DNA sequence: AAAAAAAAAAAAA
C-alpha cells in the first residue's frame, strides 16, 4: 500500500547543519488524503555544547528547558524518524521541506549513523513538496480556492496566510494545515495536482528537457517574484558541467542582450552581482534548475494566452528571444562555461555534502548502531572516511556523555570551552538584551527571553 | 544517492 507522510520540523534555528531539531511532528496518510494511524509528535533534547537562535525560539515559543523536559535524544529522535521514513512505498512531504526539512533530516541521519538519503527513493519511496504546487495551482490554474493579497497586492504564499484565505504555530497544527491545503487543491484541480505529483521525479522531469532543440517550458519558482505569479516560460541551455542534478535554463522573459555583448569571465561576475549596485545594466536572465529538488516544469501551453496576460508575461518577448538564442549557439558556448568554474568548513556537522560515504564504511556505520553505546571505544574499527571519527566522538560525547572517560570528557570540557568562549556569550548577552528591549512589552516573549539567559547560565 | 557558501525571491526557525 503506497502512503504520503506529512512532516515539519520545529527548530533552534535556520542551520539545519549548525541547528538543533526542538520538535517534531508527522501523520500518515492515503491516496485521498486521510488519515492512517495515530499522530507522531516528539521533542529532541539539546546537547550541552549549543544555544538556540533567540529569533528562531520567539517564533516557535518552544524553550529548550521544554525540549529537553519533554524531549528525548537526537539519537533516538534520529530513529523514531528513520524507523517512520523507512516505510515502503511512502512519500514524505510537507510545506517548503525540500528547501529546509529535508536538509534538517539528512543532517540529524548523518550526525546519528543513518544514511542521509534512502529514505527518499529506496523501497519505493519519494518526497514531495506543495509549496511550488500552491505557487502553480495560482499561476496556472487558480479556479476554486482563494488566494491572499496583502497591503502589497501581491500573492502570499504562507500557510497560515492560505488556511485563513479559505476558512482553516504547532508543529502538528502545520501539518494539518498542509494536509488541508493539499485536499483543496486535489479536490478543486485534480488535473494539475496528478500532473505535479507524477512529475515530482527527476527522472520523469528529464522528459520534458530537450537541450539541442532548447524546448520552451513553464517554470514556476519563487525566485522569479510574486508579481511575476513566480512564473515565466524558460528554454534550456545545457546540463551544469559538475553537477548532474542541475540543469541551465534561460529566462525568456527578459533582456537577453548582456547574453550576446558580454564574454563568460564578464557574464560569471556580472552573474553574481547585487541588484541595489546593479545600475542600468540589466542582468544575466539565467537561472539552474535542479531536478532533483522537485521543481515545477511543465510545456509551454499549459500556461494559457489568458493567464499569460493576467500574470503579466509578454508571450512574444519570449518567442522573439528563443529565436535569437536558437540563431546564436555562442551564447550556450558562453552560459556553460560560467558554471564550470572551482572554502570548506572544518566543523564535521557541515561536512555532509563533502562526498558519500562507501559501502564499507556504511556497514561499519551500521555495527556502530548496532553495538551498544557503552561497547564503542572497545570496537576497534578501521574507518576509511575521516569523517566518521568526528561523527563518532560527537555522536558519544552528545549523546551518551556517560560513555565518556576522563581524557574525552577533558577533549569534550575543551570543545564546549572553544565554542562558549566569554565574547560569544558577551554577544548572546547582548543579543538578548537588544531583543528584551526590542519587545519590552510583551510578557510572553520576556518570560522566554529570561529562560534563554537562565539556560545560556546553568548550562556553562 | 550529493553539491552548503557570490545572488536571483520568498518560503521555511
Given at each position: 500500500?503506497?502512503?504520503?507522510?506529512?512532516?515539519?520540523?520545529?527548530?533552534?534555528?535556520?542551520?539545519?547543519?549548525?541547528?538543533?531539531?526542538?520538535?517534531?511532528?508527522?501523520?500518515?496518510?492515503?491516496?485521498?488524503?486521510?488519515?492512517?494511524?495515530?499522530?507522531?509528535?516528539?521533542?529532541?533534547?539539546?546537547?550541552?555544547?549549543?544555544?538556540?537562535?533567540?529569533?528562531?525560539?520567539?517564533?516557535?515559543?518552544?524553550?529548550?528547558?521544554?525540549?529537553?523536559?519533554?524531549?528525548?535524544?537526537?539519537?533516538?529522535?534520529?530513529?523514531?524518524?528513520?524507523?517512520?521514513?523507512?516505510?515502503?512505498?511512502?512519500?514524505?512531504?510537507?510545506?517548503?521541506?525540500?528547501?529546509?526539512?529535508?536538509?534538517?533530516?539528512?543532517?540529524?541521519?548523518?550526525?546519528?549513523?543513518?544514511?542521509?538519503?534512502?529514505?527518499?527513493?529506496?523501497?519505493?519511496?519519494?518526497?514531495?513538496?506543495?509549496?511550488?504546487?500552491?505557487?502553480?495551482?495560482?499561476?496556472?490554474?487558480?479556479?476554486?480556492?482563494?488566494?491572499?493579497?496583502?497591503?502589497?497586492?501581491?500573492?502570499?504564499?504562507?500557510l497560515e496566510h492560505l488556511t485563513k484565505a479559505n476558512g482553516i504555530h504547532d508543529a502538528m497544527a502545520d501539518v494539518y494545515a498542509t494536509i488541508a491545503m493539499a485536499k483543496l487543491v486535489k479536490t478543486r484541480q485534480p488535473?494539475?495536482?496528478?500532473?505535479?505529483?507524477?512529475?515530482?521525479?527527476?527522472?520523469?522531469?528529464?522528459?520534458?528537457?530537450?537541450?539541442?532543440?532548447?524546448?520552451?517550458?513553464?517554470?514556476?519558482?519563487?525566485?522569479?517574484?510574486?508579481w511575476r505569479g513566480n512564473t515565466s516560460w524558460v528554454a534550456p541551455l545545457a546540463w551544469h558541467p559538475e553537477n548532474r542534478n542541475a540543469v541551465i535554463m534561460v529566462d525568456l522573459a527578459g533582456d537577453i542582450s548582456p547574453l550576446l555583448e558580454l564574454d563568460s569571465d564578464t557574464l560569471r561576475e556580472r552573474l553574481y552581482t547585487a541588484k541595489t549596485?546593479?545600475?542600468?545594466?540589466?542582468?544575466?536572465?539565467?537561472?539552474?534548475?535542479?531536478?532533483?529538488?522537485?521543481?515545477?516544469?511543465?510545456?509551454?501551453?499549459?500556461?494559457?494566452?489568458?493567464?499569460?496576460?493576467?500574470?503579466?508575461?509578454?508571450?512574444?518577448?519570449?518567442?522573439?528571444?528563443?529565436?535569437?538564442?536558437?540563431?546564436?549557439?555562442?551564447?550556450?558556448?558562453?552560459?556553460?562555461?560560467?558554471?564550470?568554474?572551482?572554502?570548506?568548513?572544518?566543523?564535521?556537522?557541515?561536512?555532509?555534502?563533502?562526498?558519500?560515504?562507501?559501502?564499507?564504511?556504511?556497514?561499519?556505520?551500521?555495527?556502530?548502531?548496532?553495538?551498544?553505546?557503552?561497547?564503542?571505544?572497545?570496537?576497534?574499527?578501521?574507518?576509511?572516511?575521516?569523517?566518521?571519527?568526528?561523527?563518532?566522538?560527537?555522536?558519544?560525547?552528545?549523546?551518551?556523555?556517560?560513555?565518556?572517560?576522563?581524557?574525552?570528557?577533558?577533549?569534550?570540557?575543551?570543545?564546549?570551552?572553544?565554542?562558549?568562549?566569554?565574547?560569544?556569550?558577551?554577544?548572546?548577552?547582548?543579543?538578548?538584551?537588544?531583543?528584551?528591549?526590542?519587545?519590552?512589552?510583551?510578557?510572553?516573549?520576556?518570560?522566554?527571553?529570561?529562560?534563554?539567559?537562565?539556560?545560556?547560565?546553568?548550562?556553562?
Amino acid at each position: 500500500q503506497s502512503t504520503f507522510l506529512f512532516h515539519d520540523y520545529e527548530t533552534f534555528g535556520t542551520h539545519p547543519a549548525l541547528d538543533r531539531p526542538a520538535q517534531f511532528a508527522a501523520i500518515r496518510t492515503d491516496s485521498e488524503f486521510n488519515v492512517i494511524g495515530e499522530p507522531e509528535v516528539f521533542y529532541c533534547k539539546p546537547a550541552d555544547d549549543y544555544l538556540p537562535q533567540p529569533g528562531a525560539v520567539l517564533i516557535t515559543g518552544i524553550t529548550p528547558q521544554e525540549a529537553r523536559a519533554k524531549g528525548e535524544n537526537e539519537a533516538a529522535f534520529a530513529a523514531r524518524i528513520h524507523s517512520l521514513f523507512t516505510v515502503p512505498k511512502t512519500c514524505i512531504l510537507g510545506y517548503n521541506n525540500v528547501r529546509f526539512d529535508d536538509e534538517v533530516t539528512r543532517n540529524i541521519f548523518y550526525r546519528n549513523f543513518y544514511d542521509p538519503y534512502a529514505w527518499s527513493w529506496q523501497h519505493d519511496n519519494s518526497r514531495w513538496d506543495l509549496l511550488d504546487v500552491m505557487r502553480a495551482c495560482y499561476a496556472l490554474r487558480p479556479e476554486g480556492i482563494n488566494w491572499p493579497e496583502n497591503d502589497d497586492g501581491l500573492p502570499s504564499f504562507r500557510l497560515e496566510h492560505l488556511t485563513k484565505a479559505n476558512g482553516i504555530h504547532d508543529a502538528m497544527a502545520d501539518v494539518y494545515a498542509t494536509i488541508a491545503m493539499a485536499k483543496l487543491v486535489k479536490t478543486r484541480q485534480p488535473r494539475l495536482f496528478d500532473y505535479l505529483f507524477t512529475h515530482r521525479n527527476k527522472h520523469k522531469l528529464m522528459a520534458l528537457i530537450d537541450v539541442p532543440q532548447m524546448k520552451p517550458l513553464v517554470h514556476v519558482s519563487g525566485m522569479f517574484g510574486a508579481w511575476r505569479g513566480n512564473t515565466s516560460w524558460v528554454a534550456p541551455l545545457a546540463w551544469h558541467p559538475e553537477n548532474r542534478n542541475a540543469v541551465i535554463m534561460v529566462d525568456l522573459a527578459g533582456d537577453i542582450s548582456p547574453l550576446l555583448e558580454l564574454d563568460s569571465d564578464t557574464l560569471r561576475e556580472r552573474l553574481y552581482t547585487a541588484k541595489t549596485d546593479l545600475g542600468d545594466n540589466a542582468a544575466v536572465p539565467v537561472k539552474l534548475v535542479h531536478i532533483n529538488k522537485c521543481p515545477v516544469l511543465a510545456q509551454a501551453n499549459t500556461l494559457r494566452p489568458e493567464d499569460a496576460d493576467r500574470l503579466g508575461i509578454n508571450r512574444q518577448h519570449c518567442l522573439d528571444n528563443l529565436k535569437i538564442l536558437r540563431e546564436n549557439p555562442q551564447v550556450r558556448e558562453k552560459v556553460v562555461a560560467i558554471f564550470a568554474e572551482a572554502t570548506p568548513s572544518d566543523n564535521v556537522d557541515a561536512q555532509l555534502y563533502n562526498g558519500f560515504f562507501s559501502d564499507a564504511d556504511r556497514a561499519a556505520m551500521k555495527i556502530v548502531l548496532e553495538t551498544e553505546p557503552r561497547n564503542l571505544p572497545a570496537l576497534d574499527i578501521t574507518f576509511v572516511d575521516k569523517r566518521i571519527e568526528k561523527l563518532l566522538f560527537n555522536y558519544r560525547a552528545r549523546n551518551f556523555p556517560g560513555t565518556l572517560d576522563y581524557a574525552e570528557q577533558q577533549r569534550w570540557l575543551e570543545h564546549r570551552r572553544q565554542v562558549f568562549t566569554p565574547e560569544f556569550l558577551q554577544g548572546y548577552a547582548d543579543e538578548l538584551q537588544m531583543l528584551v528591549q526590542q519587545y519590552a512589552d510583551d510578557k510572553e516573549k520576556v518570560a522566554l527571553l529570561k529562560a534563554l539567559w537562565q539556560y545560556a547560565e546553568e548550562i556553562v
